[PDB]
């Protein structure tokens, strides 16, 4: 049967297997004709030098342009001849390579995947194409204010470390890159332990490990500076101003990493077309909608290795912008003193509701494994999560926020029409209450 | 409900202060010299 | 397109405990910032006197 | 390494508003009592034998 208490017990577990040159193997059985194979890479933007910036991005594009053994677009046809979907993606820390596929065609997959992981056709045929394509994109990427505002925020505090820099880097290196640096950066960071391998589907471990199959894998970080500051780009043309706010936070692995999950569960989030209405429980979700002090808002949480980010991202008309800012803060502050057990239950429930629903479909488990390995390693503390959740207490919370919020130094990320944005020194003397 | 939180101690902390104020003001009493008090 | 913006450093403005980008602000923050508020309190003393 | 008083004191007082304000309200009391006393000599130590505090010792208690 199924009981939420029992259901934590019956799981196919993650698998652990090592290679000799540092590649890790792992797996879980979905009793499924299909399987999601992937490869995770911890090579971060913060590893690359300033000149090296945007390379891997540029590189990521180069992968499926044909590889050392298999030239351009004979590659896709096969995977297409198979019928398999193929995709990859990047992030300041992490780059991804993965495929959704049946368990049948699995054997080629690895040996297909494996080849391109390191062996790469390096030809200036693409170098200019992509460069132009990228120069196309770089100039086109200016369209979404969202992706715009982020990078500002990184550079805001994380100035002084590579962490803040663009994934795609300066437009100039886009022109200025020789594939030597590529091969060189291909050279350095693609040996293991950097490499991490997994997959999920109807595959049992051993029938993976056999065909994990003799091919290959392989043969620096610093504390980033956390800077209280502001950034303002004032432009009066557009209708709205994306504005979000943040303060630094703990690294990936830490107990506090748990409490923060429920922290944002408290505030909730509102946007235009939610069916929410005025009756919502979350104080701002109702009120900031009541006068539509926001068209939309949400929150974010991301915890780096040694670092973490906390805050919310919101959208409203300009003349009223002051409102959100005033009425956002207390929803932190009132927590810091007066907070309550029952109010957490739902959030306690929600995060419980949240993580459970995360597990549908083949691929999502596959992706989890990679970061997990890069983050906590093997750990899939599935039921333990609840235990990690059962940890939570009203005091526990009012202990947490005590750390990172009450009278701290925030940073300010904003984009036109910033104009009415309350000045900095308010926000600062506005973070900590005077008790009102 | 009432969950009467650190506010209660906070409250407990508030009034304590200005209570001194009166004593420190000019409408208090004469405590045991307790660090110099002229006669 | 730009993505390039930044001010090279505020150093001459900036101050010793933050003088390293590879140091955590949480380190200095506690004592450092208290030094700030420190000016607030003592300066109120003579006001009462 | 141990936190210098500030790190302590901030966590101790300045953080919590009252606590912050509290010692502020405290400090002045002993202060002025110490302050009023200690300064007077500076005035007085300079002003000597010109005032009955010094003078009237000549004729006081007869």
Task: Give a structural overview.
The structure is cut from a larger assembly and holds chains A (436 residues), B (39 residues), C (49 residues) and D (62 residues). Chain A has 17 helices and 11 strands. By secondary structure, chain A is an alpha+beta fold. Chain A has a 5-stranded mixed β-sheet with strand order 7-11-8-10-9, with helices on both faces. In chain A, helix 10 crosses helix 13, helix 10 (256-267) crosses helix 16 and helix 12 (321-338) crosses helix 16. Chain A starts with a helix and ends in a 5-residue tail after the last helix. Chain B has one helix at residues 7-24. Helix content of chain B is 46%, strand content 0%. Chain B has a single domain, classed as Single alpha-helices involved in coiled-coils or other helix-helix interfaces. With 39 residues, chain B is mostly helical. The longest helix of chain C has 24 residues, at 25-48. Chains in contact: A-B, A-C, A-D, B-D, C-D. The A-C interface holds A 138-139, 141-142, 151, 155, 159-161, 166, 168-171, 222-228, 248, 306, 409 and C 1, 3-6, 18, 20-26, 29, 33. Chain A: The modification Phosphoserine is found at residue 178. Chain A: It is a peripheral membrane protein. Chain A: InterPro entries: Metalloenz_LuxS/M16 (IPR011249), MPP/UQCRC_Complex (IPR050361), Pept_M16_N (IPR011765), Peptidase_M16_C (IPR007863).
**Assembly classification:** part of a larger assembly
How many strand units of chain B?
Answer: 0
Counting helices, strands and paired strands, the structural category of chain B is: mainly alpha
* Radius of gyration of CA atoms of chain C, rounded to a whole number: 17 Å
Count of spatially separate domains of chain C: 1
**Proportion of β residues of chain B?**
under 5%
How far apart the termini of chain B lie comes to 53 Å
């Amino acid at each position: 049967t199924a009981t939420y208490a029992q259901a934590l017990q019956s799981v196919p577990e993650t698998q652990v297997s090592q290679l000799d040159n540092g590649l890790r193997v792992a797996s879980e059985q979905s009793s499924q004709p299909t399987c999601t194979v992937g490869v995770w890479i911890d090579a971060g933007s913060r590893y690359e030098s300033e000149k090296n910036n945007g390379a891997g991005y540029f590189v990521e594009h180069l992968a499926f342009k044909g590889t050392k053994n298999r030239p351009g677009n004979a590659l896709e046809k096969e995977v297409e001849s198979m019928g398999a979907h193929l995709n990859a993606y990047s992030t300041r820390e992490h780059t991804a390579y993965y495929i959704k596929a049946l368990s049948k065609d699995l054997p080629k997959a690895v040996e297909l995947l494996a080849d391109i992981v390191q062996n790469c056709s390096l030809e200036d045929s693409q170098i200019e194409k992509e460069r132009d394509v990228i120069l196309q994109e770089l100039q086109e990427n200016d369209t979404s204010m969202r992706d715009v505002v982020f990078n500002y925020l990184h550079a805001t505090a994380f100035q002084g470390t590579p962490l803040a820099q663009s994934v795609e880097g300066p437009s100039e290196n886009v022109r200025k890159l020789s594939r030597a640096d590529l091969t060189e950066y291909l050279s350095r960071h693609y040996k293991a332990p950097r490499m991490v391998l997994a997959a999920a589907g109807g595959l049992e471990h051993r029938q993976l490990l056999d065909l994990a199959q003799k091919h290959f894998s392989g043969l620096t970080l610093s504390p980033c500076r956390f800077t209280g500051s502001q950034i303002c780009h004032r432009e009066d043309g557009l209708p709205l101003a994306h504005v979000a706010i943040a303060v630094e936070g703990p690294g990936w692995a830490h107990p506090d990493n748990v409490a923060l999950q429920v922290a944002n569960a408290i505030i909730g989030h509102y946007d235009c077309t939610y069916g929410g209405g005025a009756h919502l429980s979350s104080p701002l979700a109702s009120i900031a909608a009541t006068n539509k002090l926001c068209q939309s808002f949400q929150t974010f949480n991301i915890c780096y290795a040694d670092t973490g980010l906390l805050g919310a991202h919101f959208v409203c008309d300009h003349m009223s912008i002051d409102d959100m800012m005033f009425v956002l803060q207390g929803q932190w502050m009132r927590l810091c003193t007066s907070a309550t057990e029952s109010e957490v239950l739902r959030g306690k429930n929600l995060l419980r509701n949240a993580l459970v629903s995360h597990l549908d479909g083949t691929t999502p488990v596959c992706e989890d494994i990679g970061r997990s390995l890069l983050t906590y390693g093997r750990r899939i503390p599935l039921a333990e999560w609840e235990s990690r959740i059962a940890e939570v207490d009203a005091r526990v919370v009012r202990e947490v926020c005590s750390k990172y919020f009450y009278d701290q130094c925030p940073a300010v990320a904003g984009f036109g029409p910033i104009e009415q944005l309350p000045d900095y020194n308010r926000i600062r003397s506005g973070m900590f209450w005077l008790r009102f | 409900r009432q969950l009467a939180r650190n506010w209660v101690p906070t409250a407990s902390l508030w009034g304590a202060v200005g209570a001194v104020g009166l004593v420190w003001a000019t409408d208090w009493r004469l405590i045991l010299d307790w660090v110099p008090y002229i006669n | 397109s730009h993505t390039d913006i930044k001010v090279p450093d505020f150093s001459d403005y900036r101050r010793p405990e933050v003088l390293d980008s590879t140091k955590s602000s949480k380190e200095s923050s506690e004592a450092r910032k208290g030094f700030s508020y420190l000016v607030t309190a003592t300066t109120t003393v003579g006001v009462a006197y | 390494v141990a936190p210098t008083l500030t790190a302590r004191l901030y966590s101790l007082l300045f953080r919590r508003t009252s606590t912050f304000a509290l010692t502020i309200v405290v400090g002045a009391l002993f202060f002025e009592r110490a302050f009023d006393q200690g300064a007077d000599a500076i005035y007085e130590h300079i002003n000597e034998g010109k005032l009955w505090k010094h003078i009237k010792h000549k004729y006081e208690n007869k």
